[PDB]
Design a protein around this ligand. Sequence first.
Ligand SMILES: *[C@@H]1O[C@H](CO)[C@@H](O[C@@H]2O[C@H](CO)[C@@H](O[C@@H]3O[C@H](CO[C@H]4O[C@H](CO)[C@@H](O)[C@H](O[C@H]5O[C@H](CO)[C@@H](O)[C@H](O)[C@@H]5O)[C@@H]4O)[C@@H](O)[C@H](O[C@H]4O[C@H](CO)[C@@H](O)[C@H](O)[C@@H]4O[C@H]4O[C@H](CO)[C@@H](O)[C@H](O)[C@@H]4O)[C@@H]3O)[C@H](O)[C@H]2NC(C)=O)[C@H](O)[C@H]1NC(C)=O
Ligand SMILES: *[C@@H]1O[C@H](CO)[C@@H](O[C@@H]2O[C@H](CO)[C@@H](O[C@@H]3O[C@H](CO)[C@@H](O)[C@H](O[C@H]4O[C@H](CO)[C@@H](O)[C@H](O)[C@@H]4O[C@H]4O[C@H](CO)[C@@H](O)[C@H](O)[C@@H]4O)[C@@H]3O)[C@H](O)[C@H]2NC(C)=O)[C@H](O)[C@H]1NC(C)=O
Ligand SMILES: *[C@@H]1O[C@H](CO)[C@@H](O[C@@H]2O[C@H](CO)[C@@H](O)[C@H](O)[C@H]2NC(C)=O)[C@H](O)[C@H]1NC(C)=O
Ligand SMILES: *[C@@H]1O[C@H](CO)[C@@H](O[C@@H]2O[C@H](CO)[C@@H](O)[C@H](O)[C@H]2NC(C)=O)[C@H](O)[C@H]1NC(C)=O
Ligand SMILES: *[C@@H]1O[C@H](CO)[C@@H](O)[C@H](O)[C@H]1NC(C)=O
Ligand SMILES: *[C@@H]1O[C@H](CO)[C@@H](O)[C@H](O)[C@H]1NC(C)=O
Ligand SMILES: *[C@@H]1O[C@H](CO)[C@@H](O)[C@H](O)[C@H]1NC(C)=O
Ligand SMILES: *[C@@H]1O[C@H](CO)[C@@H](O)[C@H](O)[C@H]1NC(C)=O
Ligand SMILES: [Zn+2]
Ligand SMILES: [Zn+2]
Ligand SMILES: [Zn+2]
Ligand SMILES: [Zn+2]
Ligand SMILES: [Zn+2]
Ligand SMILES: [Zn+2]
Ligand SMILES: [Zn+2]
Ligand SMILES: [Zn+2]
Ligand SMILES: [Zn+2]
Ligand SMILES: [Zn+2]
Length: 761
Amino acid sequence: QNNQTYANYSAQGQPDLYPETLATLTLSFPDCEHGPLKNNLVCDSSAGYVERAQALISLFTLEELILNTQNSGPGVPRLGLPNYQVWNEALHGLDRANFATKGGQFEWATSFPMPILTTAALNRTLIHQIADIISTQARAFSNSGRYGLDVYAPNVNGFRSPLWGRGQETPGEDAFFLSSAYTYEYITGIQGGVDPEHLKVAATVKHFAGYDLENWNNQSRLGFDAIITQQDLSEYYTPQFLAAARYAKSRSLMCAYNSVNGVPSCANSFFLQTLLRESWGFPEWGYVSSDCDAVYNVFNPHDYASNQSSAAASSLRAGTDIDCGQTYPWHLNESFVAGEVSRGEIERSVTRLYANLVRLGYFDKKNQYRSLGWKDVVKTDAWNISYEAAVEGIVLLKNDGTLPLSKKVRSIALIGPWANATTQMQGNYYGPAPYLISPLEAAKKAGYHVNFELGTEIAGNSTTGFAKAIAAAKKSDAIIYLGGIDNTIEQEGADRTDIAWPGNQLDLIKQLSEVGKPLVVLQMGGGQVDSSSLKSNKKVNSLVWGGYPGQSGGVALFDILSGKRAPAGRLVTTQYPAEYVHQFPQNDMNLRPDGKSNPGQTYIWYTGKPVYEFGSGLFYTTFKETLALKFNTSSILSAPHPGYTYSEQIPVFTFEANIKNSGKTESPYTAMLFVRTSNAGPAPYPNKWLVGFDRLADIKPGHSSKLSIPIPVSALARVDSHGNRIVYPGKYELALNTDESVKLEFELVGEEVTIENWPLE
Ligand SMILES: *[C@@H]1O[C@H](CO)[C@@H](O[C@@H]2O[C@H](CO)[C@@H](O[C@@H]3O[C@H](CO[C@H]4O[C@H](CO)[C@@H](O)[C@H](O[C@H]5O[C@H](CO)[C@@H](O)[C@H](O)[C@@H]5O)[C@@H]4O)[C@@H](O)[C@H](O[C@H]4O[C@H](CO)[C@@H](O)[C@H](O)[C@@H]4O[C@H]4O[C@H](CO)[C@@H](O)[C@H](O)[C@@H]4O)[C@@H]3O)[C@H](O)[C@H]2NC(C)=O)[C@H](O)[C@H]1NC(C)=O
Ligand SMILES: *[C@@H]1O[C@H](CO)[C@@H](O[C@@H]2O[C@H](CO)[C@@H](O[C@@H]3O[C@H](CO)[C@@H](O)[C@H](O[C@H]4O[C@H](CO)[C@@H](O)[C@H](O)[C@@H]4O[C@H]4O[C@H](CO)[C@@H](O)[C@H](O)[C@@H]4O)[C@@H]3O)[C@H](O)[C@H]2NC(C)=O)[C@H](O)[C@H]1NC(C)=O
Ligand SMILES: *[C@@H]1O[C@H](CO)[C@@H](O[C@@H]2O[C@H](CO)[C@@H](O)[C@H](O)[C@H]2NC(C)=O)[C@H](O)[C@H]1NC(C)=O
Ligand SMILES: *[C@@H]1O[C@H](CO)[C@@H](O[C@@H]2O[C@H](CO)[C@@H](O)[C@H](O)[C@H]2NC(C)=O)[C@H](O)[C@H]1NC(C)=O
Ligand SMILES: *[C@@H]1O[C@H](CO)[C@@H](O)[C@H](O)[C@H]1NC(C)=O
Ligand SMILES: *[C@@H]1O[C@H](CO)[C@@H](O)[C@H](O)[C@H]1NC(C)=O
Ligand SMILES: *[C@@H]1O[C@H](CO)[C@@H](O)[C@H](O)[C@H]1NC(C)=O
Ligand SMILES: *[C@@H]1O[C@H](CO)[C@@H](O)[C@H](O)[C@H]1NC(C)=O
Ligand SMILES: [Zn+2]
Ligand SMILES: [Zn+2]
Ligand SMILES: [Zn+2]
Ligand SMILES: [Zn+2]
Ligand SMILES: [Zn+2]
Ligand SMILES: [Zn+2]
Ligand SMILES: [Zn+2]
Ligand SMILES: [Zn+2]
Ligand SMILES: [Zn+2]
Ligand SMILES: [Zn+2]
């Protein structure tokens, strides 16, 4: 929009936003005791939140309403109503806050691992706690004028194509179960429960819907025209948004840049009204924000509206309330003149925003969250949940016993482009951290003598650094190589063009494997890279996926490597062979194989051979898993369901297994539980799909713990060609983990039961 020369938004991965959209405002609170609003109902803390917002909006001029439909809302100075910023980031810690540059207070916020790594922990309680800490820190900043009260998080699109520049931001490739679980825990942590009266921070689940590429084949996200079947929309592209609106009761949602089936998401009433509000029960006074600036893109480049004013009117009437951008505040005035919008329509959207702000305590100085301050940031940071999340999520992919490092390992050759990682560890959407502990610093802190060499860049073809790296390996007891990908490889606005290791890293690794020393390789980054040559090289003793491990990443990594902590992470995406992305267009949105070039996408449908499967992870001990059936689903749905708000949450039954530590090392345990059928519902039948996961506390040698994974009705439903969610009679089989240590067949009997009627059109 703010391009100085010709810009082709069909190709260009980044928008040209106005400085107004991008501005860092100084925030404050209305003075409800003494300011111009003191006798208006909005300042009456005993009045209802809607009535309060309505009384406030009645005081605005039309121009003031229109100007306050943008993310950088100017407020209304004459009313003592401050500017308020809707655009705040919280993906894995606060970002876009007005951070102080000196003086101690507000110089930083906790930098958690990227969500891709946190999710690998398979710990729901962990995700909820991170979100609770993020929202506490958000409130502390808000109370000093340095951050807003709603956040553009979580990013929950499925990580479908493995080259997506932003898959690092997500809970992985399993949109239905794993992503939806993250969605619920995160949103309830941000908001302070399930739609509490006193909202803590408003979540903004994103990006709705069909967005999962930046610019593959030079087709920018900004003008991307996704073609998606109703079945896939229901089954893969939206179930996490159902979970956000229905279960978590997200107060906000962000519509995506792309069109789906010809209609830009922010101008898509089928999405924003029919699905979101009518089908999934998104709060009546919840509000939708556009992406920055998806409303502009309705016009340029989608050409769904012929100008900015018509783009603004179309979006507003479709159900987009707030524009992250300048299209609303600078062109809805023309819409009103042209008769395309009413003042009622504009008032509804601003009232929606302000109704949330009332719920958030924006007008109530005695609100329970208005007293959190800098010491709350300091205290919650000191809990070290960022460290805990990385330690829990790190994934052991290959091991022969080299890990954990024996006490006979005194010196290490620490080599590679991640070896001294600081800012690399933070991924993207990060603010300043209290500290950044590199693997190098942590290795020295752990007692090892460290021979450190860069070896090679992430993406070089210079071999300049190889000789010193090999020399160091020769001098040391063990070799720890840290490399892989980072945000120079995968980022917003620019997808990867391949899913191989970048540069000449694999060459250096191969040469290190020929020195005759123990070799541990750490593959870092959010997307996966093809480690087939490492899997197959006997001289690569260990392989760890370490993601983006946050502020304490170095210590998390080395605590695992030294065995101070024992790993239990499992992969949350498939590690595909490199050729996969060349086999078929990555913007084919169809999940299922098509008997042509599309081999099936994600672990659910892929017909090829992953290098490492979704769900892969090893332990420092061995576990002996043992089991500890006909179900009529119409009957199961006939019973009361105390403890469950929605009937589709009721367990059909609970899978129970005994998990015995049959090895010598105390270790936590993780499990993914998958189900298969070859006769229930429509063909083709998937490989399998995830229906449950859990993580169990440390199990000592010789000890056992019960794994209990309920199998909810919703998890057994399949999706028909119309998008309806139906539980079908037939034969099913559960399998515990990628190693399928336990299997359990069961039958569903009786009639088909409808769980969701997918609305037409
Ligand atoms: C799935 O994820 C969840 C959620 O993240 C994991 O559970 C978390 O586990 C972490 C790490 O073990 C716990 O962190 C520790 O929390 C301490 C504070 O908790 C206590 O107070 C709070 C606030 O009132 C209570 O809520 C807690 O009670 C609840 O939780 C406990 C379990 O923790 C249950 O038993 C209860 O029933 C409650 O449900 C507790 O009472 C916090 O002090 C501690 O931080 C110190 O320790 C770490 C590591 O040692 C240091 O890095 C850090 O700097 C702190 O050290 C300071 O203090 C020590 C004093 O001991 C000094 O020696 C130091 O010098 C320094 O000053 C740590 O953050 C977390 O509480 C817990 N969360 C929840 C919600 O339960 C699960 O384990 C995980 N599950 C699996 C299977 O993996
Ligand atoms: C559990 O929580 C506690 C409480 O927060 C954590 O304890 C804090 O740990 C941090 C990090 O170790 C520590 O911060 C250091 O304080 C030192 C002394 O004041 C500083 O010298 C040091 O600064 C260096 O590191 C920064 C990056 O982190 C750099 O930006 C800075 O420029 C300094 O870097 C120099 O040194 C490094 C390595 O020595 C070198 O690579 C550079 O070249 C450069 O020369 C840190 O700020 C806090 O003091 C701790 N706070 C308290 C109260 O103890 C603890 O880490 C958590 N535990 C886990 C496992 O996460
Ligand atoms: C609709 O509103 C926009 C924004 O207020 C108006 O654009 C401004 O016009 C004023 C007065 O001519 C200029 O001085 C400003 O520079 C413009 N601001 C921006 C950001 O462009 C626009 O004139 C209004 N359109 C109509 C038809 O009323
Ligand atoms: C590892 O990385 C850190 C952070 O990039 C480097 O620390 C910097 O070191 C120089 C002096 O050598 C200081 O002037 C900077 O202020 C440091 N930056 C920070 C953020 O602390 C460090 O030099 C690197 N170490 C190696 C061996 O490459
Ligand atoms: C910005 O790009 C658009 C095409 O997307 C073009 O029509 C417009 O003139 C450009 N603006 C400037 C100042 O070059
Ligand atoms: C703009 O980008 C699209 C997508 O890459 C491309 O097909 C088209 O040819 C480009 N148009 C111009 C005028 O360069
Ligand atoms: C996309 O465009 C870029 C920049 O012009 C170019 O370097 C690249 O070759 C193009 N990619 C494809 C697949 O056409
Ligand atoms: C399943 O349950 C329903 C309602 O409880 C019952 O009417 C029906 O006969 C049952 N079907 C079978 C096959 O048991
Ligand atoms: Zn007074
Ligand atoms: Zn006052
Ligand atoms: Zn909670
Ligand atoms: Zn409708
Ligand atoms: Zn389009
Ligand atoms: Zn089009
Ligand atoms: Zn205009
Ligand atoms: Zn940022
Ligand atoms: Zn123990
Ligand atoms: Zn015991």
